[PDB]
mmCIF file of N, CA and C in Angstrom:
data_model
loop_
_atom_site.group_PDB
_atom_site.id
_atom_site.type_symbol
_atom_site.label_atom_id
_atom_site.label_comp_id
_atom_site.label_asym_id
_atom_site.label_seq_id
_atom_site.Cartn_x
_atom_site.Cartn_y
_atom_site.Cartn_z
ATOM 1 N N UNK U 1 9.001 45.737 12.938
ATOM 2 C CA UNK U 1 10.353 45.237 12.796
ATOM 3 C C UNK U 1 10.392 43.886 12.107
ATOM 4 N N UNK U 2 11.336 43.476 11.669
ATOM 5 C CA UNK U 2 11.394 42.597 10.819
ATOM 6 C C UNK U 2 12.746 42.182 11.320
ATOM 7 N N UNK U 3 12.398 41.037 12.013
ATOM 8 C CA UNK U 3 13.157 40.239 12.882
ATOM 9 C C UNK U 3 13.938 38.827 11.929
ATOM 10 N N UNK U 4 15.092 38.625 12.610
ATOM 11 C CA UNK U 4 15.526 37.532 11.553
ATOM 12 C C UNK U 4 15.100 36.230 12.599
ATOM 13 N N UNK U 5 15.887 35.173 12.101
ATOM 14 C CA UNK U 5 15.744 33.812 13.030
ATOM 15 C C UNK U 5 16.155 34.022 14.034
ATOM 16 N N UNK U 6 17.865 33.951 14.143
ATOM 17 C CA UNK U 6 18.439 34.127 15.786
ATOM 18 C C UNK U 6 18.315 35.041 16.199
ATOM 19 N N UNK U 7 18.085 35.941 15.404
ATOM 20 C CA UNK U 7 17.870 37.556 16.526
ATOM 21 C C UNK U 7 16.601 38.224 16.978
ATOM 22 N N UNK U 8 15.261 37.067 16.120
ATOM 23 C CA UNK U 8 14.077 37.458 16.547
ATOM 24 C C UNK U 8 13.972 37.141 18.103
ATOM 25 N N UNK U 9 14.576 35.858 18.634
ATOM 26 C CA UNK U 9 13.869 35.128 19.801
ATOM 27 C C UNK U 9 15.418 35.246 21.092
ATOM 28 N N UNK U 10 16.422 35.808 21.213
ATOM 29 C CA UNK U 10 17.209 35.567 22.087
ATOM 30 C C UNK U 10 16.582 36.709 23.552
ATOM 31 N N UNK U 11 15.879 37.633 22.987
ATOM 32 C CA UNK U 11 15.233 38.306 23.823
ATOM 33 C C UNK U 11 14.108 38.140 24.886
ATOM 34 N N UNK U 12 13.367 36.842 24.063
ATOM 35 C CA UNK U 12 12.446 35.776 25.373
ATOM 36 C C UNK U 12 12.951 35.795 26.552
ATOM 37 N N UNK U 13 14.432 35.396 26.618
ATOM 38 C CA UNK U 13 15.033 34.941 27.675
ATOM 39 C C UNK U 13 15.292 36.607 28.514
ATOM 40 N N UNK U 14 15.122 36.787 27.487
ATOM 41 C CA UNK U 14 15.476 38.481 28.234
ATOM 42 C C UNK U 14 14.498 38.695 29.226
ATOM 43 N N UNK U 15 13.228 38.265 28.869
ATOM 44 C CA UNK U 15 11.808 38.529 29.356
ATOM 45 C C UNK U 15 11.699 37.085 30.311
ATOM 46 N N UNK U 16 12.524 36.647 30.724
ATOM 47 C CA UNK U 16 11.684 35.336 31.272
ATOM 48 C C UNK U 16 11.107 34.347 30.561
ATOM 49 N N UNK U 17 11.173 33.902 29.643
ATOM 50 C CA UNK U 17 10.889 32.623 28.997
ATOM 51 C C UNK U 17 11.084 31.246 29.146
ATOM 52 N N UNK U 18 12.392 31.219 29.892
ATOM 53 C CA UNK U 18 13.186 29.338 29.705
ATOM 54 C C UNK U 18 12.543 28.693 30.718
ATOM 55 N N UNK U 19 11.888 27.751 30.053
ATOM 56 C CA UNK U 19 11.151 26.382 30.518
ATOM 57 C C UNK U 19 9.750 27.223 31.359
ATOM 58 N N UNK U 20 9.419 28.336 31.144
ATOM 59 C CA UNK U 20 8.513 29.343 32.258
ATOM 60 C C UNK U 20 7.199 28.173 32.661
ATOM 61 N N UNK U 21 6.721 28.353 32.934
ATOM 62 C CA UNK U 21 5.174 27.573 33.410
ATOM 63 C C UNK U 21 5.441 26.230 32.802
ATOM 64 N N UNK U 22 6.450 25.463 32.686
ATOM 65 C CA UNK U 22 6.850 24.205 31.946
ATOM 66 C C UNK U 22 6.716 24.039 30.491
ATOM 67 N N UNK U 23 6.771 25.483 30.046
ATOM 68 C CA UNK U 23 6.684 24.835 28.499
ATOM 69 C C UNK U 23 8.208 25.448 27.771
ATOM 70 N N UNK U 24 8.535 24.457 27.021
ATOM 71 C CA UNK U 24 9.795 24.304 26.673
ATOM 72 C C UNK U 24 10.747 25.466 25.638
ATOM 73 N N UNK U 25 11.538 25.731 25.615
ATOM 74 C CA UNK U 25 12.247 26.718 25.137
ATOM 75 C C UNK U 25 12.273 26.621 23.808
ATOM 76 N N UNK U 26 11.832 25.057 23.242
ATOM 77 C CA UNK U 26 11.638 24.211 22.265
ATOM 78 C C UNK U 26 10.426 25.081 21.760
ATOM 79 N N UNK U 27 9.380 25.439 22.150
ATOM 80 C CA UNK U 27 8.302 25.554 21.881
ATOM 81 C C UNK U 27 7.997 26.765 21.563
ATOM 82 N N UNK U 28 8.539 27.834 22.065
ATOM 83 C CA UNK U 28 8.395 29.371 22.165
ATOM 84 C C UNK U 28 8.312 30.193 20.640
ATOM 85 N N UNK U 29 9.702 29.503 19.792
ATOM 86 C CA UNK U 29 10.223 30.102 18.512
ATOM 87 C C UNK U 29 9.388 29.567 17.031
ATOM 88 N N UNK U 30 8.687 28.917 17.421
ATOM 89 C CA UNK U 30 8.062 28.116 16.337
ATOM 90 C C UNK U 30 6.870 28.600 15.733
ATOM 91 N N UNK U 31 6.129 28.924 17.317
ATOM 92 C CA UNK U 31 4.558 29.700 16.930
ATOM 93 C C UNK U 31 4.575 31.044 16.420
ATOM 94 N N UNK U 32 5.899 31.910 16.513
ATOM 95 C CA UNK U 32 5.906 33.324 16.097
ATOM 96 C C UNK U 32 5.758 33.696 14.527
ATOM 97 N N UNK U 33 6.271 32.278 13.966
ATOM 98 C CA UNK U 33 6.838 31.982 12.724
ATOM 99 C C UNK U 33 5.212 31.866 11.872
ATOM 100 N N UNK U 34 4.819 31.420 12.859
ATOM 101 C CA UNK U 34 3.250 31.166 12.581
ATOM 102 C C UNK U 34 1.929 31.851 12.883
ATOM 103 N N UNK U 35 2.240 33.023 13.679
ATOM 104 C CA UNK U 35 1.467 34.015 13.356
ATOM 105 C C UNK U 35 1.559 35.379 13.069
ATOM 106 N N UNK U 36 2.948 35.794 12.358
ATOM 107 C CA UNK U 36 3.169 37.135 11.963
ATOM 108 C C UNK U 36 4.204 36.956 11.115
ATOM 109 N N UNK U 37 4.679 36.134 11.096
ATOM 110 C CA UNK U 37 6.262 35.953 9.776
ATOM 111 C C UNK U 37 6.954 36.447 10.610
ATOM 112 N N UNK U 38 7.584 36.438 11.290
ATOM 113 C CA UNK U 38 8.823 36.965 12.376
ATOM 114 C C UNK U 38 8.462 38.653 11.883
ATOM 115 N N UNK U 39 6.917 39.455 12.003
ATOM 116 C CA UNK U 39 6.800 41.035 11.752
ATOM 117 C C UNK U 39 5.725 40.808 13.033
ATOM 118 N N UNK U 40 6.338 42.457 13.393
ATOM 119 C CA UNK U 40 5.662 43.001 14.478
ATOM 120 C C UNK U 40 4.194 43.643 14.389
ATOM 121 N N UNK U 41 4.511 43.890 12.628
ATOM 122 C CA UNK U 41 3.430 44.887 12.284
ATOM 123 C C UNK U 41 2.562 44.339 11.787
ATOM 124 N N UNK U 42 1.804 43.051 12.197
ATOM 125 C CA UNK U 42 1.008 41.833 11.039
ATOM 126 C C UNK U 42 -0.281 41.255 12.408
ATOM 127 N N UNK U 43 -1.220 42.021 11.967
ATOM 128 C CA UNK U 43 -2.396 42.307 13.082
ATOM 129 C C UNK U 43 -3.467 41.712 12.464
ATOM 130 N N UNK U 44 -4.489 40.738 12.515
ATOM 131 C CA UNK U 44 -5.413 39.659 11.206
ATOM 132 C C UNK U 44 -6.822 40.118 12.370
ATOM 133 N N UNK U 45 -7.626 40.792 11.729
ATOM 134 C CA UNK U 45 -9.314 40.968 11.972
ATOM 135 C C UNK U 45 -9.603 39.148 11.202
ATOM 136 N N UNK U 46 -10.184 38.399 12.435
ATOM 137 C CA UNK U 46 -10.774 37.310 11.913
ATOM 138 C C UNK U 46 -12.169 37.707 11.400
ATOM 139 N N UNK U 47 -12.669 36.531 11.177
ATOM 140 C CA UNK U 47 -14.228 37.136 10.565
ATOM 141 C C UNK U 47 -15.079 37.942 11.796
ATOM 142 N N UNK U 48 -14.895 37.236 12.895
ATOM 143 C CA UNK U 48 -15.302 37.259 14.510
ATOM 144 C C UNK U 48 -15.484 38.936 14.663
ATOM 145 N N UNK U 49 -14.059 39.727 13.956
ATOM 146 C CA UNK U 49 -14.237 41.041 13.497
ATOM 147 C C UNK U 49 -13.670 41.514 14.640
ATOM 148 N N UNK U 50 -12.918 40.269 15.969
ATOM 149 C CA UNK U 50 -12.263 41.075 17.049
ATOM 150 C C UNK U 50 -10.840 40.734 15.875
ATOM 151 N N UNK U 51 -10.127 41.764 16.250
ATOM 152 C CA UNK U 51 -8.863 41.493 15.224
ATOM 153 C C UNK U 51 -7.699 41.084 16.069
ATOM 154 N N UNK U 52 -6.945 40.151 15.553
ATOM 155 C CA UNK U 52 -5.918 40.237 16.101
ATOM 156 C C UNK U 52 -4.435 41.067 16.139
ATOM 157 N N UNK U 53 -3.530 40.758 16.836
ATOM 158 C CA UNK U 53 -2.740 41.870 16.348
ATOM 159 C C UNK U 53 -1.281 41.250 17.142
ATOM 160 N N UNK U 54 -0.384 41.912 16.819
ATOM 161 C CA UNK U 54 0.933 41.575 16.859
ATOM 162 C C UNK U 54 1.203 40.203 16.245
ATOM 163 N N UNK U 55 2.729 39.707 16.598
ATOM 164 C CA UNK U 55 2.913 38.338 15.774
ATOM 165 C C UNK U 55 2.773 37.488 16.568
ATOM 166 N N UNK U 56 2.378 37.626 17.624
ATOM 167 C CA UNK U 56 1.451 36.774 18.645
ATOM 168 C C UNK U 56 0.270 36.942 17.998
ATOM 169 N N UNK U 57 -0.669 38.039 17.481
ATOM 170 C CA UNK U 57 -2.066 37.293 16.646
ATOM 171 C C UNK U 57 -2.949 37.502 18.108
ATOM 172 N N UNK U 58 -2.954 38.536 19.073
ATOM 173 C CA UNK U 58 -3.453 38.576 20.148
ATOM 174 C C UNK U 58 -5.279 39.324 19.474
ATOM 175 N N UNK U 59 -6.368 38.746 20.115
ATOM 176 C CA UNK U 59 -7.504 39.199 19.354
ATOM 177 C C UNK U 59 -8.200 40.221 20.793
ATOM 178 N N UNK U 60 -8.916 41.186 19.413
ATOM 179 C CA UNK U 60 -9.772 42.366 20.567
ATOM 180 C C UNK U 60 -10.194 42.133 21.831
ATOM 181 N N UNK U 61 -11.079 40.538 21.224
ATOM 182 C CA UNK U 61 -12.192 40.219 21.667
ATOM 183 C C UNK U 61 -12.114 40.296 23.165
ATOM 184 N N UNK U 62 -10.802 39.099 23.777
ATOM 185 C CA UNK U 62 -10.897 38.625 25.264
ATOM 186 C C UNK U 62 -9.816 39.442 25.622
ATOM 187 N N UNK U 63 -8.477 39.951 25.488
ATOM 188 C CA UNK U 63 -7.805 40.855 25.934
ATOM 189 C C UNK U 63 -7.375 42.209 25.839
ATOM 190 N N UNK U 64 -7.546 42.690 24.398
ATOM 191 C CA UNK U 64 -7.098 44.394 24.987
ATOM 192 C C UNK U 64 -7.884 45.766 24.433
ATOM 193 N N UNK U 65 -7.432 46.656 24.533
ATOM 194 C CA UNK U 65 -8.225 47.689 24.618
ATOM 195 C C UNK U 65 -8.053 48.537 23.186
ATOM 196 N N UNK U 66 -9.454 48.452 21.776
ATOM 197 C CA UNK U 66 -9.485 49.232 20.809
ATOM 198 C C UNK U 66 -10.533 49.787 20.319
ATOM 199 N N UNK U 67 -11.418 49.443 21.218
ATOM 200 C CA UNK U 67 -13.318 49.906 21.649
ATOM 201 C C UNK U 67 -14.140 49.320 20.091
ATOM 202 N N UNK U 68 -13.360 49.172 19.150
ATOM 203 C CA UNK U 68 -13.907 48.734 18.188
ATOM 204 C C UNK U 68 -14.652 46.998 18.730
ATOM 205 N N UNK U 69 -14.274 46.793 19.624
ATOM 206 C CA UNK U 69 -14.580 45.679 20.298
ATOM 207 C C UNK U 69 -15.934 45.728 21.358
ATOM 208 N N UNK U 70 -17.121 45.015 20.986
ATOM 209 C CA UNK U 70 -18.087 45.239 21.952
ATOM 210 C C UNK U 70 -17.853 44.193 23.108
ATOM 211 N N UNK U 71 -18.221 44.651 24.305
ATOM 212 C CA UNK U 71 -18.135 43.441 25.389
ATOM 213 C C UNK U 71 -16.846 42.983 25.744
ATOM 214 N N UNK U 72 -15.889 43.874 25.277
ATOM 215 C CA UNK U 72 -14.871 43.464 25.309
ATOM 216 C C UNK U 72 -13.957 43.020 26.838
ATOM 217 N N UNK U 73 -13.477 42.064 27.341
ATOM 218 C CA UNK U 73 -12.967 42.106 28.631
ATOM 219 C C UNK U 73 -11.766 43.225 29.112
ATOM 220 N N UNK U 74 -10.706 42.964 28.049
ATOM 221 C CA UNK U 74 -9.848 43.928 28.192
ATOM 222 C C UNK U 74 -9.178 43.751 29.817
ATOM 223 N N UNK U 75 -8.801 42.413 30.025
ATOM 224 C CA UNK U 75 -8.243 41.662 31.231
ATOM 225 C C UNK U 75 -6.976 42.519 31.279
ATOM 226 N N UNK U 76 -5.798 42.656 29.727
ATOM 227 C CA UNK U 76 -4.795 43.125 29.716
ATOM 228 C C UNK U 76 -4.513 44.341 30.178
ATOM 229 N N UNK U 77 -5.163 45.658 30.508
ATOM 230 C CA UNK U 77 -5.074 46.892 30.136
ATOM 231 C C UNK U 77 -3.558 46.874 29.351
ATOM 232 N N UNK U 78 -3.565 47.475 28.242
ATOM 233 C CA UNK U 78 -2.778 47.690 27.287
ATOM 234 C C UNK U 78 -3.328 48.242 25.894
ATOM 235 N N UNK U 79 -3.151 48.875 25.435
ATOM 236 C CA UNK U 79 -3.518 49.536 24.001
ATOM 237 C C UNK U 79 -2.681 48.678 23.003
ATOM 238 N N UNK U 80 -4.264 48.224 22.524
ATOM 239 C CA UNK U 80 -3.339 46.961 21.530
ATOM 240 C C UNK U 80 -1.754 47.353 20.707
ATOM 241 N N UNK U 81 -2.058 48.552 20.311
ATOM 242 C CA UNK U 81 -1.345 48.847 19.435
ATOM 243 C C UNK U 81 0.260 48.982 20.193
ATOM 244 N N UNK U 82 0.181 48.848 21.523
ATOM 245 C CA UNK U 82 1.471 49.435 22.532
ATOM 246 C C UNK U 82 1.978 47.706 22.219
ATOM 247 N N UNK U 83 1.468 46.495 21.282
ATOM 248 C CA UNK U 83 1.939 45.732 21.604
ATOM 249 C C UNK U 83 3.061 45.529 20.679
ATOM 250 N N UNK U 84 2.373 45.858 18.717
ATOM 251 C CA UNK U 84 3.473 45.991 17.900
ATOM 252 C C UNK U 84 4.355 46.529 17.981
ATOM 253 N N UNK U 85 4.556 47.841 18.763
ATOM 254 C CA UNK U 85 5.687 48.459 18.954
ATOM 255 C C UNK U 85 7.592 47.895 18.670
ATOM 256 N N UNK U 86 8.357 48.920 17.948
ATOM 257 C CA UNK U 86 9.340 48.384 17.991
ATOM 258 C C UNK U 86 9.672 47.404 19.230
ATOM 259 N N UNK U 87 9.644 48.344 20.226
ATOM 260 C CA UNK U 87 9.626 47.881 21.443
ATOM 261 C C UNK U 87 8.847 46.715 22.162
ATOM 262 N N UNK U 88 9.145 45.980 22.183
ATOM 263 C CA UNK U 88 7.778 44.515 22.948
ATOM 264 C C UNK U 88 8.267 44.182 24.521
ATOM 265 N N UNK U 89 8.903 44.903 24.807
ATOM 266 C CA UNK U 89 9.542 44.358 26.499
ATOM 267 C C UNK U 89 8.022 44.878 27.344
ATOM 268 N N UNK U 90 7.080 45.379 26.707
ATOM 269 C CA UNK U 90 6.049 44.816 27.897
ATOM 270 C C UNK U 90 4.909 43.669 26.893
ATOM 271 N N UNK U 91 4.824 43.489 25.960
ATOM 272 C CA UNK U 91 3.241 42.308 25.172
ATOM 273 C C UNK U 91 3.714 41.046 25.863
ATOM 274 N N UNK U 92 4.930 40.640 26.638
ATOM 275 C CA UNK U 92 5.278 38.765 26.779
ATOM 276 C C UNK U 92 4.427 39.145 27.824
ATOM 277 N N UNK U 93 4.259 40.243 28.936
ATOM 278 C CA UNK U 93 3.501 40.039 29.810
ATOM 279 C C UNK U 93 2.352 39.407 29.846
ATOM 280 N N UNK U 94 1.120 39.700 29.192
ATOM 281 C CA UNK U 94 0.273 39.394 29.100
ATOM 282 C C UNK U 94 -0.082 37.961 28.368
ATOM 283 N N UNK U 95 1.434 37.569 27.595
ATOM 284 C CA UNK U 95 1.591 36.099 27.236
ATOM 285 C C UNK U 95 2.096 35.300 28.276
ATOM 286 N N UNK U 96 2.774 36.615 29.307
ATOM 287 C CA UNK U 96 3.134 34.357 30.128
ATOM 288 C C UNK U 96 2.094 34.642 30.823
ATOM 289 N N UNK U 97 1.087 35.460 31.153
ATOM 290 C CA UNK U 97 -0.166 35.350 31.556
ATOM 291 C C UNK U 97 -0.958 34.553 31.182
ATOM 292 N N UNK U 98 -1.215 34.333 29.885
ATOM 293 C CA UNK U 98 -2.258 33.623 28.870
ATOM 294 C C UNK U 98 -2.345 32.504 29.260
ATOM 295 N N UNK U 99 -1.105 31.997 29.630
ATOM 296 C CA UNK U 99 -1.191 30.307 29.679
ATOM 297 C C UNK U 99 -1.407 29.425 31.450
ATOM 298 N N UNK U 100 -0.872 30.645 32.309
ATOM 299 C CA UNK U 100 -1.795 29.982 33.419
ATOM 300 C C UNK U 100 -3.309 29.755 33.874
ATOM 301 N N UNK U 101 -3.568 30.101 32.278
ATOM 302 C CA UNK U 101 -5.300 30.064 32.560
ATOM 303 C C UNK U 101 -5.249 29.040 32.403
ATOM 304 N N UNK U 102 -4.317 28.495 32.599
ATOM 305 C CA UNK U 102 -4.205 26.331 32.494
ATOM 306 C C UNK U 102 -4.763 25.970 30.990
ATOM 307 N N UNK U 103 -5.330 26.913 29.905
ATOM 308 C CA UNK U 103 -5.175 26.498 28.530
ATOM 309 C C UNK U 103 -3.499 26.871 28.570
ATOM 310 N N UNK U 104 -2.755 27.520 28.873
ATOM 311 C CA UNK U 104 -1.680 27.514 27.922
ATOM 312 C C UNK U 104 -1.710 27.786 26.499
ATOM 313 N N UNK U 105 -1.050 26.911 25.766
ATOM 314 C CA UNK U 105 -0.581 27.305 24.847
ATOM 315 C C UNK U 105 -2.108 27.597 23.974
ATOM 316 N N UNK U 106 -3.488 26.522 24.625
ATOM 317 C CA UNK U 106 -4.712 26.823 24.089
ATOM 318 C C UNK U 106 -5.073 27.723 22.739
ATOM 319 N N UNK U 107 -4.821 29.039 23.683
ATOM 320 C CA UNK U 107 -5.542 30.391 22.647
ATOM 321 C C UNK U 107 -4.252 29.841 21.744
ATOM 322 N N UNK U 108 -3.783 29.881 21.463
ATOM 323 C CA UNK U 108 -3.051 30.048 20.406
ATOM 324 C C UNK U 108 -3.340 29.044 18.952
ATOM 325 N N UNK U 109 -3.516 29.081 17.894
ATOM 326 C CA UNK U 109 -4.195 28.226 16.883
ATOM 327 C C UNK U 109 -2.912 27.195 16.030
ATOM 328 N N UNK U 110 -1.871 28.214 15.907
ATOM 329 C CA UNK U 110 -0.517 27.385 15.055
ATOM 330 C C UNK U 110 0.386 26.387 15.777
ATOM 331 N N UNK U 111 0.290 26.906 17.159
ATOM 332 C CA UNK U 111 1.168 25.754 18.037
ATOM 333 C C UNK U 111 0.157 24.721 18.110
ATOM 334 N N UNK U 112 -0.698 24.594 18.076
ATOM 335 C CA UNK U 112 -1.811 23.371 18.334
ATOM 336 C C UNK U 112 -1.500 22.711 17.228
ATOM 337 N N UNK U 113 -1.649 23.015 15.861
ATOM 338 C CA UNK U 113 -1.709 22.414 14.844
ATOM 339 C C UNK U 113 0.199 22.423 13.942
ATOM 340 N N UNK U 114 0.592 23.518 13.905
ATOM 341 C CA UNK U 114 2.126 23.963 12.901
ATOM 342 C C UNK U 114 3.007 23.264 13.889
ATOM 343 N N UNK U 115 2.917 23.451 15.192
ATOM 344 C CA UNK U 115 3.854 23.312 16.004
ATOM 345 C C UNK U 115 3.676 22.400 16.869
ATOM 346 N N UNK U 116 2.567 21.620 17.114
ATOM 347 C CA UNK U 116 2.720 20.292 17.993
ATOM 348 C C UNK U 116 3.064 19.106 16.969
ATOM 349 N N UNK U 117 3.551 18.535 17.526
ATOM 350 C CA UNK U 117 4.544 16.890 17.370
ATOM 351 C C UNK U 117 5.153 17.121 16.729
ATOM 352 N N UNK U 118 6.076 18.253 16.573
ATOM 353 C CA UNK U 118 6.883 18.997 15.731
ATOM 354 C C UNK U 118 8.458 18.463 16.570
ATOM 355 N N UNK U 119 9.603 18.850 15.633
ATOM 356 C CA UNK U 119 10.974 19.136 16.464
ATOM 357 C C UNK U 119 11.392 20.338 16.780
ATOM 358 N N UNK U 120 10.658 20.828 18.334
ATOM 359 C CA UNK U 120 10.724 22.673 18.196
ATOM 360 C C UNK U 120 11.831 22.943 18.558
ATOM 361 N N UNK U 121 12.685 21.879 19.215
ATOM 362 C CA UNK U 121 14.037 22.192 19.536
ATOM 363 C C UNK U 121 14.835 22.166 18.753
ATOM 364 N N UNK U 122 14.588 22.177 17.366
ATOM 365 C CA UNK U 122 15.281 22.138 15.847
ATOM 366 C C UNK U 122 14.660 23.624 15.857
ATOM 367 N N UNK U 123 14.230 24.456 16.274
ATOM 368 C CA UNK U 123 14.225 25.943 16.220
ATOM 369 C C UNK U 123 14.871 27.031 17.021
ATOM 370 N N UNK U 124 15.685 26.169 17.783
ATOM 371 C CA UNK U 124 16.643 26.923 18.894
ATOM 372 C C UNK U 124 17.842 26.361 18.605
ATOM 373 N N UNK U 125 17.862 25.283 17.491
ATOM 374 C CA UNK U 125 18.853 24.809 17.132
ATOM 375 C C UNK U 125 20.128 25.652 16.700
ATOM 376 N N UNK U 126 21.784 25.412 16.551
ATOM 377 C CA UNK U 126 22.412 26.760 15.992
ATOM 378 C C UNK U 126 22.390 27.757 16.657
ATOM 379 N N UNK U 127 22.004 28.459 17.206
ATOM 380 C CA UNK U 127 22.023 29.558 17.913
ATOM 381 C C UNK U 127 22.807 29.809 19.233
ATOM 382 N N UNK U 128 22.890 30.976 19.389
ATOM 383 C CA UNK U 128 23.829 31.239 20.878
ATOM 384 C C UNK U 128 23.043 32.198 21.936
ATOM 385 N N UNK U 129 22.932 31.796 22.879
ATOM 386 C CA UNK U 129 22.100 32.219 24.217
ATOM 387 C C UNK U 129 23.263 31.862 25.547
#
């Protein structure tokens, strides 16, 4: 799917998102932008060769299940591929999971760098929720 600005992210809230584990509503819309182009269908094999996948950029390696993955933990049970789905009302699961591993936003590579000391609340800006 090919999500626009306001209509990619009003659905977070659908899922539980606002202010969740203390990170800001500010913060949520910024990193998506940064690892899939607001597309569902945009999955990146790093060199590492665990691939990632959805526009979260979720990799083989430490969470889900595509056997192309050796050693794989597969903490999520989920079939990676159940994550691009038109449908995503179950992949936030395993994201507001991610971050009580007390890394938080950690795994993630674009909010560390695209999206910190940023104005992320200039990305929820305009919009109606």
């Amino acid at each position: 799917k090919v999500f626009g600005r306001c209509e990619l992210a009003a659905a977070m809230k659908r899922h539980g998102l606002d202010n969740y584990r203390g990170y800001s509503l500010g913060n949520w819309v910024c990193a998506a932008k940064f690892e899939s182009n607001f597309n569902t269908q945009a999955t990146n094999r790093n060199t590492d060769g665990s691939t990632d996948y959805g526009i979260l950029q979720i990799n083989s390696r430490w969470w889900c299940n595509d056997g192309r993955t050796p050693g794989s933990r597969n903490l999520c049970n989920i079939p990676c591929s159940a994550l691009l789905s038109s449908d995503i009302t179950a992949s936030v699961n395993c994201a507001k999971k991610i971050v009580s591993d007390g890394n938080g936003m950690n795994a993630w590579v674009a909010w560390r760098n695209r999206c910190k000391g940023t104005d992320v609340q200039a990305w929820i800006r305009g919009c109606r929720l």
